[PDB]
């Protein structure tokens, strides 16, 4: 299964949800890169909540 | 089972629309009437080997 993410959708995710941007700030430049972070987020319980 | 994501940097949207119209046009071509159906073939020579 494939999901498409535009950068406008990423900006809307960051603006509408501060928790995702909070995880992005301390996870993406530190340990693992951006698409791995989005895959982990979409496979997480936070996306379901 | 597996999760795959697509990241587009706001430039390849026109490419996906080009693909979408390309399956659209091949579907309309494969559902088009044949040339012998929309046009009368009696004005041309008879079929043969």
């Amino acid at each position: 299964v494939n999901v498409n993410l535009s950068r406008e959708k990423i900006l809307n995710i960051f603006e509408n949800y501060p928790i995702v941007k909070k995880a992005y700030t301390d996870n993406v430049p530190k340990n693992f890169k951006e698409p791995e972070f989005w895959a982990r987020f979409f496979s997480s319980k936070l996306f379901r909540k | 089972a597996t999760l795959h994501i697509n990241i587009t940097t706001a430039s390849d949207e026109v490419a996906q629309r080009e693909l979408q119209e390309r399956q659209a046009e091949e579907k309309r071509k494969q559902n088009a009437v044949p040339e012998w159906h929309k046009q009368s073939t009696i004005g041309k020579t008879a079929l043969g080997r």
Binding site: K33, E36 | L3, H4
Partner: peptide
């Protein structure tokens, strides 16, 4: 089954990561 499912998921995430890094 559980270990092969979770290891399949983690290699799928790594495959997405290195595919993106090869593209970028």
């Amino acid at each position: 089954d559980n270990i092969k499912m979770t290891l399949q998921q983690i290699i799928s995430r790594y495959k997405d990561a290195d595919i993106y890094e090869e593209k970028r």
